[PDB]
Design an enzyme around this catalytic site. Structure first.
Site, PDB file in Angstrom:
ATOM      1  N   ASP A   1      -0.956  -3.703  -5.483  1.00 38.68           N
ATOM      2  CA  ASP A   1      -1.217  -2.522  -4.660  1.00 38.68           C
ATOM      3  C   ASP A   1       0.064  -2.037  -3.978  1.00 38.68           C
TER       4      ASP A   1
ATOM      5  N   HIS B   1       0.820  -1.212   0.000  1.00 42.50           N
ATOM      6  CA  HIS B   1       0.000   0.000   0.000  1.00 42.50           C
ATOM      7  C   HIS B   1       0.855   1.263   0.000  1.00 42.50           C
TER       8      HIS B   1
ATOM      9  N   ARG C   1     -14.626  -3.588  -7.427  1.00 46.11           N
ATOM     10  CA  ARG C   1     -14.376  -2.352  -8.161  1.00 46.11           C
ATOM     11  C   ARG C   1     -15.633  -1.861  -8.865  1.00 46.11           C
TER      12      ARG C   1
ATOM     13  N   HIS D   1      -2.437 -10.077  -8.550  1.00 42.10           N
ATOM     14  CA  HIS D   1      -2.843  -8.988  -7.663  1.00 42.10           C
ATOM     15  C   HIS D   1      -4.096  -9.365  -6.878  1.00 42.10           C
TER      16      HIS D   1
ATOM     17  N   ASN E   1      -5.669  -2.829  -7.621  1.00 42.02           N
ATOM     18  CA  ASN E   1      -6.662  -1.764  -7.633  1.00 42.02           C
ATOM     19  C   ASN E   1      -6.148  -0.481  -6.999  1.00 42.02           C
TER      20      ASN E   1
ATOM     21  N   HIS F   1      -4.805  -6.275  -2.628  1.00 40.89           N
ATOM     22  CA  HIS F   1      -5.717  -5.152  -2.863  1.00 40.89           C
ATOM     23  C   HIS F   1      -7.030  -5.336  -2.106  1.00 40.89           C
TER      24      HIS F   1
END
Lengths: 180, 298, 135, 11
Positions: B92, B66, B221, B173, B124, B248
């Protein structure tokens, strides 16, 4: 709570979930403006900024952007994705060393041949509109950064070399800096 | 990389080590010509590798950092700093804050010094667009100018997409996708690339490993195609795959083994947005394709 | 080559025919590299994106002399009628095959060349072959 | 002599 201030130099309160702007052009003591990333569909007021030497309105959803010709002078003026068909204040604020078109719908650049001071003539993601802006930019020699950019005439690799040879006065050529 | 580039890489490594074990937010900036050359070299090297990379066992693969300099430094101190250990982020890797730039610079420096001990991916939260990931574009716009931002965007688009650990564990991911058919079109899809809203790479980066669907469906999403358990099982059976990495997401346990220990949802996101106290974790992949849950702080 | 004419082909838009040799000033010399082949057609725009396959094959000057050993009108003077007849039987037959089709008659496939041979007769055949693009 | 078999002079 962004109405006005006496001694203020930097302001950034954008990227809000609500597109509400209150008194965005109330103070007159600022020298640099960063009005980009506006969540409103149109700009609140831009004609009141006559003393600011730096304008930044990049990636703004404010489609309507007027009053750009009311500024007496502005050393920096960024109008990327401003939603304005033409750039105002080119004759009034002609002391700008940088210019952003950002795929401008205008075929030619507004007085670029007589503009022998803008060292950053950027027109990103151009179609391109026309080659008259290119000729006007090539007429001057005091430009450093020039972006065409990503037009349909770049398909032939010889076209890129010919363009690079034709314009040696530009220090940088869009992405790859011109060897000059 | 280059002499100036290698010197800058060593300086950035030293700065990150000095900022290791402390609060995050490192930047690790550079010169103008030197940074331009380093970005060009990094783009050339990343575009040189195929979209489907292969991991070198053993490795200490982390979850979703992150964009945290403190989390990356802690992973380097515990899981093995580069180039002493191979790192492979699931996704991410960049997010909100001023600490993703340091992690990206460290990964690029490690790849330049040792490409077999450095790897990272996007999800994402680390997308190339500010619509899905503004923790990079907005940060560059606020701090730096537009030319460097364009160079960074081009270099990121010139990067690889997926990775595999001895053809045993897929370093994805998020979850599976219904649009992904085989590796022939994956390796053929060279630079540039980005995480879309819908499709296969879009489902990998934005969607997560779904179980409420079978072949395809909606995702978190809102546009991604979070492939269900049946789609992931069919893809694994056809491709002889066994494990898929997931990131993510706000994982309360950090590393979650899904699809019967076939979807290790390792997430290194500690205290996601403060309110969501997501745990940090890493996937410690041994030399014999032994996936271990290396949990970390939340 | 890579350390001498690096920018000479990288994003240089070099649309040279497949088979050409150009001298390049590299290493205090003039290194000529002959275009061995091209995946694209002969005139291919050599750019940084173009993958220039390169091996360690050095081209000897014998092939250079042979290419310079072209065949034209160097020992043939005055055989204008014969040369024109041959060209019409070849070029006009080829460059204007539609002319023959409209003429409704094929040209003479069997043409005999009498005379003192090797006085240029062998040279005549060599000039024909050099000019001729067909087998 | 070979085509697309040796690593080429990358720029």
């Amino acid at each position: 709570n962004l109405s006005n201030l006496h001694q203020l130099q930097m302001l950034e309160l954008g990227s809000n979930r609500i597109r509400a702007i209150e008194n965005i052009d109330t103070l007159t003591n600022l020298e640099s403006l960063f009005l980009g990333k506006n969540k409103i569909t149109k700009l609140q007021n831009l004609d009141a900024l006559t003393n600011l030497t730096v304008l930044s309105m990049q990636s703004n959803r404010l489609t309507k952007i007027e009053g750009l010709q009311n500024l007496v002078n502005l050393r920096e003026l960024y109008l990327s994705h401003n939603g304005i068909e033409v750039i105002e204040g080119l004759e009034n604020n002609n002391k700008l060393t940088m210019l952003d078109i950002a795929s401008n719908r205008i075929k030619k650049i507004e007085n670029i041949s007589h503009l022998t001071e803008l060292q950053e003539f950027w027109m990103n993601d151009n179609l391109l509109e026309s080659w008259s802006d290119l000729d006007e930019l090539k007429g001057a020699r005091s430009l450093e950064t020039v972006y065409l950019e990503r037009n349909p005439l770049q398909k032939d690799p010889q076209y890129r070399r010919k363009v690079m040879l034709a314009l040696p006065s530009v220090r940088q050529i869009d992405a790859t800096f011109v060897r000059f | 990389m280059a002499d100036l580039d290698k010197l800058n890489i060593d300086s950035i490594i030293q700065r990150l080590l000095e900022v290791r074990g402390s609060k995050p937010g490192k930047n690790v900036q550079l010169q103008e010509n030197e940074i331009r050359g380093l970005c060009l070299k990094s783009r050339e090297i990343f575009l040189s590798q195929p979209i489907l990379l292969e991991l070198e066992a053993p490795l200490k693969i982390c979850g979703d950092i992150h964009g945290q300099y403190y989390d990356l430094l802690r992973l380097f101190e515990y899981g093995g700093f580069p180039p002493e250990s191979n790192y492979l982020f699931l996704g991410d890797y960049v997010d909100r804050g001023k600490q993703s730039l340091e992690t990206i610079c460290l990964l690029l420096a490690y790849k330049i010094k040792y490409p077999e001990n450095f790897f990272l991916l996007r999800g994402n939260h680390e997308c190339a667009s500010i619509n899905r990931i503004y923790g990079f574009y907005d940060e560059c716009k606020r701090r730096y100018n537009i030319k460097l931002w364009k160079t960074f965007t081009d270099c990121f688009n010139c990067l690889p997409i997926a990775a595999i650990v001895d053809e045993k564990i897929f370093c994805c991911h998020g979850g599976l996708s219904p649009d992904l058919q085989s590796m022939e079109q994956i390796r053929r899809i060279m630079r540039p690339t980005d995480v879309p809203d819908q499709g296969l790479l879009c489902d990998l980066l934005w969607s997560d490993p779904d179980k409420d669907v079978l072949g395809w469906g909606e995702n978190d999403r809102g546009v991604s195609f979070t492939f269900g358990a049946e789609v992931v099982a069919k893809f694994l059976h056809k491709h002889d795959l066994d494990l898929i990495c997931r990131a993510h997401q706000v994982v309360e346990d950090g590393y979650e083994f899904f699809a019967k220990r076939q979807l290790v949802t390792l997430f290194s996101a500690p205290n996601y947005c403060g309110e969501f106290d997501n745990a940090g974790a890493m996937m410690s992949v041994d030399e014999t394709l032994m996936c271990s849950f290396q949990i970390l702080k939340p | 080559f890579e350390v001498y004419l690096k920018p000479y082909f990288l994003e240089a838009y070099r649309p040279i025919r497949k088979g050409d040799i150009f001298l390049v000033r590299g290493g205090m010399r003039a290194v000529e590299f002959k275009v061995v082949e091209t995946d694209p057609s002969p005139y291919c725009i050599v750019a940084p994106d173009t993958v220039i396959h390169c091996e360690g094959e050095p081209i000897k000057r014998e092939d250079e002399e042979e290419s310079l050993n072209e065949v034209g009108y160097d020992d043939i003077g005055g055989c204008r009628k014969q040369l024109a007849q041959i060209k019409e039987m070849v070029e006009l037959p080829l460059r204007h095959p539609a002319l023959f089709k409209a003429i409704g008659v094929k040209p003479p496939r069997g043409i005999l060349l009498y005379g003192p041979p090797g006085t240029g007769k062998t040279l005549i055949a060599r000039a024909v072959a050099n000019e001729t693009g067909a087998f | 002599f070979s085509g697309e078999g040796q690593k080429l002079g990358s720029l």
